[PDB]
Design an enzyme around this catalytic site. Structure first.
Site, PDB file in Angstrom:
ATOM      1  CD  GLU A  35      52.125 124.262  52.243  1.00 23.21           C
ATOM      2  OE1 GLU A  35      51.829 123.560  53.239  1.00 23.21           O
ATOM      3  OE2 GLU A  35      51.577 125.367  52.018  1.00 23.21           O
ATOM      4  CG  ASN A  46      42.817 121.688  61.650  1.00 24.71           C
ATOM      5  OD1 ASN A  46      42.110 121.575  62.641  1.00 24.71           O
ATOM      6  ND2 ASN A  46      43.067 122.844  61.102  1.00 24.71           N
ATOM      7  CG  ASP A  49      39.646 121.670  59.512  1.00 30.16           C
ATOM      8  OD1 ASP A  49      40.353 120.679  59.747  1.00 30.16           O
ATOM      9  OD2 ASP A  49      40.001 122.566  58.738  1.00 30.16           O
ATOM     10  CB  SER A  51      40.299 117.733  56.968  1.00 25.71           C
ATOM     11  OG  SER A  51      40.977 118.966  57.067  1.00 25.71           O
ATOM     12  CG  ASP A  53      46.774 119.931  54.621  1.00 31.63           C
ATOM     13  OD1 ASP A  53      47.304 121.078  54.714  1.00 31.63           O
ATOM     14  OD2 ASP A  53      45.607 119.715  54.209  1.00 31.63           O
ATOM     15  CG  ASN A  60      42.010 120.127  53.487  1.00 28.54           C
ATOM     16  OD1 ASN A  60      40.810 120.059  53.281  1.00 28.54           O
ATOM     17  ND2 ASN A  60      42.526 120.099  54.698  1.00 28.54           N
TER      18      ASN A  60
END
Ligand SMILES: *[C@@H]1O[C@H](CO)[C@@H](O[C@@H]2O[C@H](CO)[C@@H](O)[C@H](O)[C@H]2NC(C)=O)[C@H](O)[C@H]1NC(C)=O
Length: 130
Positions: A35, A46, A49, A51, A53, A60
Site C-alpha cells: 500500500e 484518484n 472519483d 478523492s 488515499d 481513503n
C-alpha cells in the site's frame, strides 16, 4: 517517514494490531508493504472519483478521513487526513482498525487482496522479534 520492516512490526504489535479481528501481524505488514512501501507521507489521488488515499495504510478521503476537498465525504474515522501523514502512526492505526470493523474487513485494501490473500506472508515478520 519510511519505516524499516521490523521497526514497523514492533510498532504495530505495540499498538495492538496483531491478531486484531483475527488479523495476523504479517498480514498488516503485507498490506503496508504493498500500500505504501512503509512511507507515512504516501498519498495517491484518484482523478476519476476525485478523492485521495493517505499514508501508510492508504486510507481513503471519501469514507474515513477528511481533507475538506473530497466530494461526498463521510469521515467515519472522525479524523483529518493530515493526521494520517504524521511520522507517528498511532492515529493511522486506530482508523485502520475502524476500517476492518466494517462488513468487509480487510478486503477493504486492494493491495492486500492482490498480493497477500492466500499467500505465505511470514517473511514480513521474520527476524523482527515479534
Ligand atoms: C477503498 O475504496 C473502496 C471503494 O473503491 C472502499 O470500499 C467501500 O468501503 C465501504 C466500507 O467498507 C463499503 O460500504 C463499500 O461498499 C465499499 N465499496 C467496495 C466496492 O468495496 C474502501 O473502504 C477503501 N479502502 C480504503 C483503505 O480506504
Amino acid at each position: 517517514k519510511v519505516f524499516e520492516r521490523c521497526e514497523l512490526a514492533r510498532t504495530l504489535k505495540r499498538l495492538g494490531m496483531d491478531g486484531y479481528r483475527g488479523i495476523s501481524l504479517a498480514n498488516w505488514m503485507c498490506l503496508a508493504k504493498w500500500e505504501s512501501g512503509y512511507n507515512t507521507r504516501a498519498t495517491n489521488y484518484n482523478a476519476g472519483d476525485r478523492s485521495t488515499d493517505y499514508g501508510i495504510f492508504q486510507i481513503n478521503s471519501r469514507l474515513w478521513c477528511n481533507d475538506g476537498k473530497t466530494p461526498g465525504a463521510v469521515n467515519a474515522c472522525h479524523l483529518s487526513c493530515s493526521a494520517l501523514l504524521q511520522d507517528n502512526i498511532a492515529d493511522a492505526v486506530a482508523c485502520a482498525k475502524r476500517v476492518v470493523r466494517d462488513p468487509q474487513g480487510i478486503r477493504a485494501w486492494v493491495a492486500w487482496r492482490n498480493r497477500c490473500q492466500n499467500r505465505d506472508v511470514r517473511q514480513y515478520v521474520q527476524g523482527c522479534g515479534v
